[PDB]
Amino acid sequence: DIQMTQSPSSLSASVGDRVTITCRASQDIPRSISGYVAWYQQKPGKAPKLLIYWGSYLYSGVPSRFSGSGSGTDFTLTISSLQPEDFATYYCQQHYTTPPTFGQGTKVEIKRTVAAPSVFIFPPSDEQLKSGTASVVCLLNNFYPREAKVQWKVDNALQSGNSQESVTEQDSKDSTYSLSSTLTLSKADYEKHKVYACEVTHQGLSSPVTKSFNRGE
Amino acid sequence: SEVQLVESGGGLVQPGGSLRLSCAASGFNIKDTYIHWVRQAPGKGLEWVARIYPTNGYTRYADSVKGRFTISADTSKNTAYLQMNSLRAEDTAVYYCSRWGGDGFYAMDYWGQGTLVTVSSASTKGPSVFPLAPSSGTAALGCLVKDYFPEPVTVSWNSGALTSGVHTFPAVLQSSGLYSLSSVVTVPSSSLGTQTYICNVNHKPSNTKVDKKVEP
Helix, strand or coil: CCCEEEECCEEEEECCCCEEEEEEECCCCCCCCECCEEEEEECCCCCCEEEEECCCEECCCCCCCEEEEEECCEEEEEECCCCHHHCEEEEEEECCCCCCEECCCEEEEEECCCECCEEEEECCCHHHHCCCEEEEEEEEEEEECCCCEEEEEECCEECCCCEEEEECCCCCCCCCEEEEEEEEEEHHHHHCCCEEEEEEECCCCCCCEEEEEECCC | CCCEEEEECCEEECCCCCEEEEEEEECCCHHHCCEEEEEECCCCCCEEEEEEECCCCEEEECCCCCCCEEEEEECCCCEEEEEECCCCHHHCEEEEEEECCECCECCCCEECCCEEEEECCCCCECCEEEEECCCCCEEEEEEEEEEEECCCCEEEEHHHCCCCCEEECCCEECCCCCEEEEEEEEEEHHHECCECEEEEEEEHHHCEEEEEEECC
16 A cells, blocks of 8 residues: 655745655555656645646646656655645655555745735624624734734733634735734623724834724714 | 546435545546545545456455445446545545546546545534624725634635735634634725625535625
8 A cells, every 4th residue: 555755845936936746655656667757836725737647747737947856765756846826735746556645735925025914903794793793803904924913902901812813825917925814802892992903013114003093983 | 528526415414424425527538547536534534445447347446445435337328436434534635536547557647626524523503794894095894704613615706807905814713622724815995885895605514605895
């Protein structure tokens, strides 16, 4: 039962870079044998797509910047000039025999210039407050790199355990991330506090940015 | 017409329960090759689970599903199937239909879009949709899609006409056990009042389909 073990697990590289991903079979196969590995590209929330078959043959429609090679137990995918579209997880596969088996995956992220997030704050809707709960939402739009810290402040009282964050997958055109933080409070709680603030830190900001609002304007 | 594989049948199901996925093939006869199911648990890799040779009905399974899942194929409907029985939390995954290219081609050249199977004892719940309203030369506005289960939800804007600048965030699982996401879009602040903005939320598990007008 041939296992495929792929490396590295994650990597970060710039547009134009040569990127090299590796894949090894568990079964001892000699140098005289080749052309039994295929390579797939999977973008977030999509089906995998065939890039390379038989070790080194380029699948129709795939850009010429992708190439593969290998023999014995060792195979390689090379992207000669990394593009922003190339953000994806890359999987190798053996088609020597059955069952078909896959490598664990290699996550490629695109390294680009630093961009500070643009920050926007959203009070809870009226339509919502009737339900007896209040969500306040902070948006950090289009930034790089991914690390960023968001703190909520209610009348200066720093919040904890009542918020959750979500961050999008790297954008395939501009290579940025965006992030939402959602502060969930009961109506009774939300009514009895005045100024609602969102404090964002990021390596692109010389100083933390604060978007806020007062309840009712 | 062009080669294409369309999965259907996924959704929520209780542990110990049964479910049947379909895979409609187009632009070739499934008789000419093998059809596979390959699945992917959330945040994990790709796991081959079954294959079939439609002409004579020959099947093989991964050990992980052997004895519980059955694959089949109706040549006359050019459609493949996965009968999943005695389901468990671990079977939660996106299930893809794929094929082998043919006689000399054991790579998987076409895959469907995948169908999500969620194994759980929690029940279906439609979202509430609240507006994320803008105010103050660029505007941000959005919709909060809150308190729904199971995954997924689609969000478009202005019936699919607005896609530039749109971010729809991955769902987060609340401690209540219900999902919540937001979808936002940045626009030029000049349009506010002139052009209206609506988000089209769709949750096929509860047959919920809601439009919401976002404004100050």
